[PDB]
Ligand binder design. Structure first.
Ligand SMILES: Cc1cc(C)c2c(c1)S(=O)(=O)NC(=O)N2
Ligand SMILES: Cc1cc(C)c2c(c1)S(=O)(=O)NC(=O)N2
Ligand SMILES: [Zn+2]
Length: 257
């Protein structure tokens, strides 16, 4: 099935998932001089003080940190959003080299990695119903550049040895995602999709302007994960990013001048 190799990567996905050539696919290049400042956009409200992390999973495409989303514990509101969106998981996309790895680009710049904090619109009752709706999800995207270490990321880095291969999971309680946020919540926003199959067009993307800095050693440890399962030939989990897709009839809005 689908992956990031030459025979099953992004250029092949449309054969099983024809929406790959759809009208609101993600990621996109953010042309900063074409995005319009929208003074009607509100500040983001990121309320993660009560977040309850549960588990970390290597799903063969990335590693996902999963949260308890059975109550309004960690929520995203405001910005372009109507209503309340509940945090369900986060994961990253990254490169084989520091020069690439992000999915979104900024004036064609590729960052070393990109963090996706995935939230679902509570009006639909659960995640499975939400992904069926054009306003079902809000994904907060945060760029990573290589520089100083991110202290709040280290607990993630240090558990990766225990989920090296596809299908492995580990307990991952009491992780505070506030330690992954930059100082500023200035953002760009546009309507898009999941960036892997099934590529559903159900996402309000909110991409922060300010990257976070992680150390070379931190991102090097991401690159030791495996796409394969245990007992299969080793294929390093690197370059698990989809390139920019056509913007088509969409406008990217900026929260900031
Ligand atoms: C607000 C809303 C609207 C529609 C059409 C819905 C739902 C909520 S729902 O609760 O997610 N389930 C469903 O099948 N259709
Ligand atoms: C809801 C969701 C599901 C999947 C598989 C996703 C994303 C969101 S995502 O945040 O668009 N990035 C990605 O690679 N896969
Ligand atoms: Zn993602």
């Amino acid at each position: 099935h689908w992956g990031y190799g030459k025979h099953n990567g992004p250029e092949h996905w449309h054969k099983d998932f024809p929406i790959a050539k759809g009208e609101r696919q993600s990621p996109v290049d953010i042309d900063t001089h074409t995005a319009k400042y929208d003074p009607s956009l509100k500040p983001l409200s990121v309320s993660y003080d009560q977040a309850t992390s549960l588990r970390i999973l290597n799903n063969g495409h990335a590693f996902n940190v999963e949260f308890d989303d059975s109550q309004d514990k960690a929520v995203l509101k405001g910005g372009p959003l109507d209503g309340t969106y509940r945090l369900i998981q986060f994961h990253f996309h990254w490169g084989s080299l520091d020069g690439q790895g992000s999915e979104h680009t900024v004036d064609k710049k590729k960052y070393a990695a990109e963090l996706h904090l995935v939230h679902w619109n509570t009006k639909y009752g659960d995640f499975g119903k939400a992904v069926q709706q054009p306003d079902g999800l809000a994904v907060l995207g945060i760029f990573l550049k290589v520089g100083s270490a991110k202290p709040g990321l280290q607990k993630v880095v240090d558990v990766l040895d225990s989920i090296k291969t596809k299908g492995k999971s580990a307990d991952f309680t009491n992780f505070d995602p506030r330690g992954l946020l930059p100082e500023s919540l200035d953002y760009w926003t546009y309507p898009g999709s999941l960036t892997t199959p099934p590529l559903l067009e159900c996402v309000t993307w909110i991409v922060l302007k300010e990257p976070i800095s992680v150390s070379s050693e931190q991102v090097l440890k991401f690159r030791k994960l495996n796409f394969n399962g245990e007992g299969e030939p080793e294929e390093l989990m690197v370059d698990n990013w989809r390139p920019a897709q056509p913007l088509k009839n969409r406008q990217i809005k900026a929260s900031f001048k």
